[PDB]
Design a protein around this ligand. Sequence first.
Ligand code: 7F1
Lengths: 186, 219, 217, 187, 189, 219, 219, 215, 199
Amino acid sequence: TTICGLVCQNAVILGADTRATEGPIVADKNCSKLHYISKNIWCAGAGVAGDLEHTTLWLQHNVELHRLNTNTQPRVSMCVSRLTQELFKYVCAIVLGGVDVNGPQLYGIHPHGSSCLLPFTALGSGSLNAMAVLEAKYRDNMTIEEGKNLVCEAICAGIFNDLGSGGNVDICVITKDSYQHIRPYK
Amino acid sequence: YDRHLTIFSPDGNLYQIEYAIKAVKNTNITSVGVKGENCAVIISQKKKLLDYNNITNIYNITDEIGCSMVGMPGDCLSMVYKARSEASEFLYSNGYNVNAETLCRNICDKIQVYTQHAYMRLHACSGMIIGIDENNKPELFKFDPSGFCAGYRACVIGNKEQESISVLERLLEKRDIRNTTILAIEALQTIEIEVAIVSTKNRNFTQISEKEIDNYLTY
Amino acid sequence: VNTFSPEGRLFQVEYALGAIKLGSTAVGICVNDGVILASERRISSTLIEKDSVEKLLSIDDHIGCAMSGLMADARTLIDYARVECNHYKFIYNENINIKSCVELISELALDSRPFGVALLIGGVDKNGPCLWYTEPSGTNTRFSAASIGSAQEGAELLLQENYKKDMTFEQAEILALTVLRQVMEDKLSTSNVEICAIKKSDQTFYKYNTDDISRII
Amino acid sequence: VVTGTSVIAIKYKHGIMIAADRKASYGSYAKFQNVERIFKINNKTVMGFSGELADAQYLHELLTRKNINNLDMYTPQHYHSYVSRVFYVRKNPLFNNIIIAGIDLYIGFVDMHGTNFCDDYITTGYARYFALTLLRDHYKDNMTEEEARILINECLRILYFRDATSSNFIQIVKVTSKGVEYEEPYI
Amino acid sequence: TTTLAFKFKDGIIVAVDSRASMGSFISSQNVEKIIEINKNILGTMAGGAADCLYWEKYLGKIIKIYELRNNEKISVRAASTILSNILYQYCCGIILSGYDHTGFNMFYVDDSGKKVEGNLFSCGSGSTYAYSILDSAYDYNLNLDQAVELARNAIYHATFRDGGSGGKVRVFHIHKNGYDKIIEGEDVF
Amino acid sequence: DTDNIIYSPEGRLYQVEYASEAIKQGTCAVAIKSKDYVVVSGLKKCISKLSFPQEKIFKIDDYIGISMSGITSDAKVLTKFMQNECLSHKFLYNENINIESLVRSVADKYQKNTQKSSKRAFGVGLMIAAYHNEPCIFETRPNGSYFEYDALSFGARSHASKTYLEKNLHLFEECSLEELILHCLKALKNTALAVVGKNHPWQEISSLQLEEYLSKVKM
Amino acid sequence: YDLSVSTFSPDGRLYQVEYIYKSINNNNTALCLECKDGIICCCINSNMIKKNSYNRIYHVNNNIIITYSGFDGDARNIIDRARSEANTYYYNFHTNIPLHILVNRISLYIHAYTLYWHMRPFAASIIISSFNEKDKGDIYCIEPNGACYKYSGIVIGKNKEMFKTEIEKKDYKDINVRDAIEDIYKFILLVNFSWICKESSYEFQNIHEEILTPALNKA
Amino acid sequence: TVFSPDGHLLQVEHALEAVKKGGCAVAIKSSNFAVLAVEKKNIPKLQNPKTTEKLIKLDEHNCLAFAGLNADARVLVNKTRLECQRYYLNMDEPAPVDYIAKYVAKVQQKFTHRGGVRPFGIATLIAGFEICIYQTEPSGIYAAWKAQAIGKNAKIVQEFLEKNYQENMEQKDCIFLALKAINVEVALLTEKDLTFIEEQEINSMVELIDQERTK
Amino acid sequence: PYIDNGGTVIGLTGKDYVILAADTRLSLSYSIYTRFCPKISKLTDKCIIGSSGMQSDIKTLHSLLQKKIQLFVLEHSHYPDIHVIARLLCVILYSRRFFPYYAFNILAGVDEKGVLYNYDSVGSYCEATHSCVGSGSQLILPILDNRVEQKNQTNFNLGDDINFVKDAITSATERDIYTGDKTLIYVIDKMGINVNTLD
Ligand SMILES: */C(=C\S(C)(=O)=O)[C@H](Cc1c[nH]c2ccccc12)NC(=O)[C@H](CC(C)C)NC(=O)[C@H](Cc1c[nH]c2ccccc12)NC(=O)CN1CCOCC1
């Protein structure tokens, strides 16, 4: 599982792989590693699918419910505290991109629960293979179109280069005003 | 009997709640909390060998938040300690400081649970709450021993209440720190004192300086 | 419950006294050679299985305890007393000294509702038979000779009339049979009594066979 | 995992010496060359630890919080028995060989298991081999201060050279009728 | 150790080795393994000394309060079943022996809590050895003379053939009343 | 009204006050303090010609012993508690219990009973008499109050003993134990007496030697 | 209405709380004075039975001081609460407690019991104080049902209002360095004077009896 | 609850009355047999309306009858079932009527004693095995009996029963005395087996008692 | 959580007495702590007790049992029989079998002729004519076997017996490393309980 996301000139742009695997044989032609925690904040987890569907469910509802309970748009860092606190109680990395009162923030979250704000990120088997191409071409304040093409490039590289990663891609531009998803980037 | 306990009337109207409000309304420590344009003032009269230097109603419960309190004093120190507990748990859980109303969900709900549950007595204290919101608009709320997140552009509490609503209206027709604080200190004069603004540092909530008490009072 | 009276006596527990007066009588007499233990057996209805109901019981093998007042509360206190005064001997052979069995039962009896019963526990543990009345109030006391039930109101004097320490347990049997036959309406027979004994030697608890009491009378 | 290799204590009628070096090796190597392992629970009582550090400060705060309530005063004996009782409760644990000492005079040792006892001279940690026998060799009652401290100084002298982990300089305490004195000077 | 029990005509009987060694070393040969519970029933411990002693005394308690409760003697299968019900929570196997039925019943409760009823149980380390003699020399019910010689005999071969058990012999024929008692030293002749 | 969970308009609690209306029925007991010794006599009331009278005295520890005079059950419960506590003390610290730590503890138990509504106040008041070094006499009112004493008498017609206490210094003739005990038997006037101090700890001279000592008041 | 600690009166007063003021109004005086060079709490207990000792004042640390008035038991228990609090804070924070936070802690402690329908409020007002050169002397008096207040010296207990004429000479009361005592001994027209001053080394101390002599012999 | 100055308990004395006004039941006893017979009134149209009145079987070798509240009876009885099963588990042997009378008594008492619980409204009576019968009053007392009657007007049935009493008798004829004391809820404990007596079987006898009283 | 120490405490019932001797020396795996330790405690009355397990368990176990005898005697006003003492020990010890006390233990008392109870760590108690425990047991028991019992071949004069104890132990120091040269020796003749610091 590659998952790559990167900040542009006003919006985070996340992109991720779409192919589950049992370890030997593939067990799915497709999956959703771009869950929608809220209109202007999403998570892209990598790891065991089970744990991921779990904590993303519990997260989505903690955040949507808390948003119902208060005026403020659930600003991106609260999701990071909730998630990291949950993982800290105890195997699933995440990469979450949202836009808010601050900048288009993007975070990466380690399996032990560690958090970091990041300019651009990847996780999973493809991470290495994504750190290679991603870092080389990155520039702060890219035109969002540059995000549109790049993140697909680093994803495709982190696809072709791993046995454990493959299949069609999907990408989204989390503007603060709106998410703009597309089901198959490919 | 219905009066001896927190239960409904034959008329369907709760009693002991009204009595707790008499506790506040006979506490006789009036306090005017008016919002200012891009700021907000909260004032109270500070009322022997006793120390006026100690006395206050105003109290902060985070840097951004300060809540004047009136009523039975022990309940006040308790509701303040509860308030601080509340903001600390929210910050700890979520990494954001509470919006003033978010602190009023805790203040007003904790103050509420007393009302149904017959045992523990209804809350005997009330007061304003002020703080800069995530929205840049300053936020001034209130609460009642009966649950109320309220909501105001201006408020008064204590022995005086809606008596001074019409009095406040005259400032409301004229409602910067100069311009707003004078409305408050006058509103004490209109019907020493201790003044408290969030706009010192525009987000940090601090009681205004002692040396600068007089200059508004003499202007 | 424990609302102290202005008079200073505890209310509840002082209301609970009367329950023993409901009690049918029994006369325990510690003696130099044992403890005799008599009680009414004429309590019986004509059609209850004859003599199939004992007032006198046995907390342990060498303890026997006639009861006052409510039959139920007595059945409970005897239940827990059997349990505890057995549990005392869990690996070491000695059975609980009577004074301390009774001390248990009372120290529990102190603290629902106060028990309506009084007990007359007896047994041989120290070189010498013991006779302990437990008041419902939890006050615990060692008589040499004593009686329970409402008939104990005036029958007690009779003990004062006759009680010398120096008696063969048989002499004591005559004595307690005297005092208890006196308060009965029926001329005493084995259906009028349910006598038991704990010897200074045998130390064993033993309800008398009816043939025995029929023989002495 | 900080550790303090040794502590010793010795007594004579006019008072009771008790000393240790200030090193606090953090595994293979020294971290704190100036740690304070000797600690003063009472004007007539101190605890000296020689094992893992954290546990030692833990027991330090415990004995103190335990004291202020009683501050007749809590005897060194009661302090020692509370100490051992704590180790043995913990066991069923904390790593130290804390010794209690103070005042007539009282020295008591406690092994890690809550094993404990009382003697005229006690040594703790690496000292036991490299100081105790020597300090078992020349020890005598009613040593004057000069005799005694020159004796313990001969012992720490043997020790710093033989013990793998010691500091050159010794925090040192003597308990006297006047009150406990924690000498500042180190060597 | 080594424990034996069997029922001939006149009753159930109990036999045992008094040795109680902690490892190769012998802690004691004075040790008594036979224990009475209710006035008529009794059991023999085998295996660990402390746990077996504990459970026997515990059994004495539970049985005693029951016996006080109903004011009578409980059947042997009861006393078996209580240990079967408690031991299953966790020791050492045991044998029980008593009179409720016109014949004395015999039982054997495993440390596993397995319960078994039968005619000539034996346990302990040396059980196998006397346990041969119990059918080679007792296919069927016999006499008290025959029986005390029998148990003394089978214990003797469980004494010679096994180093883990020995010491004194201690046979206890049980009458319909209570029981008898016999103890011996070496009997090689 | 009618529960110790509320104060009277006077400002008094009645329930706890009723405890002394309990204790006055109890038989008098008296105590004397020689400089190195303490002597405590009781009075064992006899319910019948055949009753053997109960013993007021107990023996909580080596040098500690007590003399409760109120309802017996609470008294025994306090004894079992004080004994279990002294033994917990020694079991912890290989040391005899401080007497005053004990008094402070038992008195804490009284207050814990006389504050909580559901638990009734004790109808008994201990008169502890002991020392861990120098002789002492403590009294515990059926509440959290406890007082040290030089000489104390309490229960029934203890009034005679009280007025009599003024007639002798507690140690007007301390130096001899026989002087002491004769003051004890005068002050109070089978009946009990007990002795504790210096070398011999607690002791109960209820022997026939005491029976000999009885004539000494009239000898 | 007056029957509950919790139920409000029709006029919002809490009569059951209000009675604790009566209790304390009758109970023994316990002045605490403040010098401009220290603090001196004192007591005048008015309780042959021992007369030698019955200290009301007690500390939570060798520097902080407590004094009370009212039921002895409840206050002794609150002193236990304060010891455990100061020591808890010393276990957590490796320092001695500021007097202020301890005072608010006891405010909450005493306050809690008022809210519970079964629970009985404590009947004892509590002075708590400390003085250091840097930590200037302050005397917090705690009336039950909260509202602890800082003071320059408050008399509490039975006769406090008639002593306030003397304490109101607090200019003269602050004038003293170590002779405020000698003034008090005539002013008041068993006793427990103490020390928290520079000469005290700021640590609390019972005033020396041969220092007590100059006061009594002064007139 | 609480003692009145007399020392009598009220909730219990009140509690009895629900039995002192309830459907009558009786038991007649002998060696290996006993006749338990109650009476319950129901609407004629509804044959199924009280298959519940019928005498309960706590164990194959045990049997019960009761009078008072049914709603409380179902509770007590179930506790009895669970308990006979518990004893029969811990012993691997059936519960003697003695021990179960003791257990049930301990319960009814317990509720009278410990707080938080309303006292029972029922009076029980139990047959088991030789065979012997135990009646248990709401107070928590219990007693062996040779014959007894629970229910409304128990005294007429019972004291008239004394006028007719005779001990051991016939397996069938011992039934007749129950009727002579007492539609009908008949059951016969025998062979340590409770049995629901055939409806028609007694009909012959049902005739004679109807007419021996007439002729 | 267990360390081995050799308290070598031995009991020995005389014809009208009991004798309980023990080396005082304490020791770690191979180094002597105190030269002098109390391996024997006095139960409050006519009986005493010894052990040889790890010293924490020795001390805390003797503490506990002392607390129990003191509590029992104060609650019942009655000094316990020796049997209730040892039985109570089986109780306390088995109550913790899942995490056993390491202190193997010895009791010596009189019933009014030294009734005795030596036993294993979990309370498997036994009476005996004599007793030994600690690392010095296995060595001395044959010496005690023959001096008094003559199972394959007058034995309790106080002088002759204290002598047998003496020579048995003094020999025990020689062949064993854990046994210390000092010995306490108690003697519970019916009058009272003597102590001896013979070494
Ligand atoms: C990333 C692979 S990796 C090596 O880079 O970390 C993916 C992430 C993923 C896959 N699917 C989703 C959906 C939503 C979000 C994220 C998602 N994870 C994996 O490839 C897992 C490999 C683990 C060991 C790292 N694969 C699985 O967990 C298996 C999925 C599966 C099995 N059967 C199926 C049927 C239908 C759909 C999916 C599956 N299952 C397991 O490994 C079984 N585990 C065993 C232990 O944990 C719980 C179940």
